[PDB]
Amino acid sequence: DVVMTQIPLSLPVNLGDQASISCRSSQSLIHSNGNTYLHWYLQKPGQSPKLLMYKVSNRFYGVPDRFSGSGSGTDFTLKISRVEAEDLGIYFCSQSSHVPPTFGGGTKLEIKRADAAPTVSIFPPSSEQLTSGGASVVCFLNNFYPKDINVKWKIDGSERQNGVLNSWTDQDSKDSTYSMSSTLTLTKDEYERHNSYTCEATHKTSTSPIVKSFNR
């Protein structure tokens, strides 16, 4: 299959800016009829793809004048010119020069934010949960930026890796930060028999990790 890869996975942009997603082909896309079937879809959150660009540089009906298209052979590039609220989403690059037509991994267009460190909070096993014998501990890492963040569970001093279940909000549209939440599940019993419980976050804005804890 013609592996299509496109980088970067995210592209922090300022509305105002120009941007440029780039994309690349394992084999070439110059077809026996001398033609290149590289196309560009844009998929807005919770929706279906919309064609933007076909055959490298030809815009599609409706899609506006900021969407210059380019590249050749094996490296094609899409450049939005003054980004807008309207064109934020996942950009997929696709090839139909060969068969089966394959799709590029996508690139998220995101808003650029002044860094923010996570306000983290740890929460212990509720009584009610304990009275049926399971103990989820929970740590909310809220309103941070960038999305890169590393929460570990220091569980009595010695770290643990099983039962962690992370979930992640997408960019909050009011303040462009991300928020993540980690629940470490436990058997009530197990819980019963260990003291310190420390949720902890490695994230740019502190060369120290951020650590919050409760002793059992």
Binding site: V138, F140, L165, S167, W168, T169, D172, S179, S181
Partner: peptide, 20 residues
């Protein structure tokens, strides 16, 4: 404003979610 709900995750066939 202030509420963040997090996307459901499987945990042995069933879902788990959390708002804050």
């Amino acid at each position: 404003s202030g509420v963040h709900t997090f996307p459901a995750v499987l945990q042995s066939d069933l879902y788990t979610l959390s708002s804050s």
